[PDB]
């Protein structure tokens, strides 16, 4: 009869200004007929894109979520929505004869975004260690978790989303948590494994053009 794809317009997807590469791909949506508006159709789509496809000179085990808020004439504009690591990365990091330490915080940014951040870290074996295991005592991991919980709070509460994201691209929060925990028990693979977005402010068109330069 008729190919249902003959009623579909293609749109390009743009990443915000924090990333070097802006074009991330294309989507499609059925055209408008009455009260069936395409622009209302493609608002709210989430794209999970590897960091290496946004920063061509970065790691490929980090992923960012981008959600569409507007459609400005064949281009749909996205905003930060979440972040997480890869299953391969996590499963490779989890090993046996060491200890895992994890934490989670809820922090609201200055500009009104509420985020839940998760952090992970693993105990490290020494160069001259003869023993098989490198476990940490229970009060040693309550100190480490306390330090993860306060560094994540201060580095999100102080600043807004645009420059919070610029701290996630190189993962500078985990690098600070690693430095500040070697006097308790040296840590090995410290990452912000996940960032989840809870609440949003009332949408403003003025502040989305800023995020696209």
């Amino acid at each position: 009869v008729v190919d249902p794809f003959s009623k579909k317009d293609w749109y390009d997807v743009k990443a915000p200004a924090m990333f070097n590469i802006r074009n991330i791909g294309k989507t499609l949506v059925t055209r408008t007929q009455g009260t069936k508006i395409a622009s209302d159709g493609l608002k709210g789509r989430v794209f999970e894109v590897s960091l290496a496809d946004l920063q061509n000179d970065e790691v490929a085990f980090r992923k960012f979520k981008l959600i569409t808020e507007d459609v400005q004439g064949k281009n749909c504009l996205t905003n930060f929505h979440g972040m997480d690591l890869t299953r391969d990365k996590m499963c490779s990091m989890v090993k046996k004869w060491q200890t895992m330490i994890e934490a989670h915080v809820d922090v609201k940014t200055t500009d009104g975004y509420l985020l839940r951040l998760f952090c992970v870290g693993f105990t490290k074996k020494r160069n001259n260690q003869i023993r098989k295991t490198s476990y940490a005592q229970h009060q040693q991991v309550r100190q480490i978790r306390k330090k993860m919980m306060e560094i994540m709070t201060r580095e999100v509460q102080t600043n807004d989303l645009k420059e919070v994201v610029n701290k996630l691209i190189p993962d500078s929060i985990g690098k600070d948590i690693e430095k500040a925990c070697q006097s308790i028990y040296p840590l090995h693979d410290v990452f912000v494994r996940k960032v989840k977005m809870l609440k949003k402010p009332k949408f403003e068109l003025g502040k989305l053009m800023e995020l696209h330069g």
């Binding site: 794809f5 579909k8 293609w10 997807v13 991330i24 791909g25 294309k26 989507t27 499609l28 949506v29 493609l42 789509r45 989430v46 794209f47 590897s50 490929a60 890869t86 299953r87 391969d88």
Partner: protein, 135 residues
């Protein structure tokens, strides 16, 4: 037909491959997973129930998907490999290997491959019993 793109540029889709021990799904959608382009299973090709999980049936499914994708400008695919997950098995089915060759031999370009099987942090009781399946 398809996007108006220069010849030297790749247009990416996403291939969800769900390989269980009873069937195999090959499911190509756009980059968001919201609009699907094509879906072919093993049961759509063969007529015997025992061959739905066959590696051969997963080959005729990915060739009929790659043919349809090479009709709308979809030139490259990101691969999301799935097992049943949950309480049940975490290992992909026999048709999992033969579906990554049928769509590669067909002429597609391969992006990034990732496992998307569902692992519970901890879950409900599994079927069977405390003595399991006695056959």
């Amino acid at each position: 037909l398809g996007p108006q793109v220069a010849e030297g540029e790749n247009v990416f889709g996403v291939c969800h491959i769900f390989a269980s021990f009873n069937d195999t799904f090959v499911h190509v959608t756009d980059l968001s997973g919201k609009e699907t382009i094509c879906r072919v299973t093993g049961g759509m090709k063969v007529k015997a129930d025992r061959d739905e999980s066959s590696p051969y049936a997963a080959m005729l499914a990915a060739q009929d998907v790659a043919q349809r994708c090479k009709e709308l400008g979809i030139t490259a695919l990101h691969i999301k490999l799935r097992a049943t997950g949950g309480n049940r098995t975490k290992t992909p089915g026999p048709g999992a290997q033969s579906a990554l060759r049928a769509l590669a031999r067909s002429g597609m370009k391969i992006g990034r491959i990732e496992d998307v099987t569902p692992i519970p942090s901890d879950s409900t009781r599994r079927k069977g019993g405390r003595r399991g399946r006695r056959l």
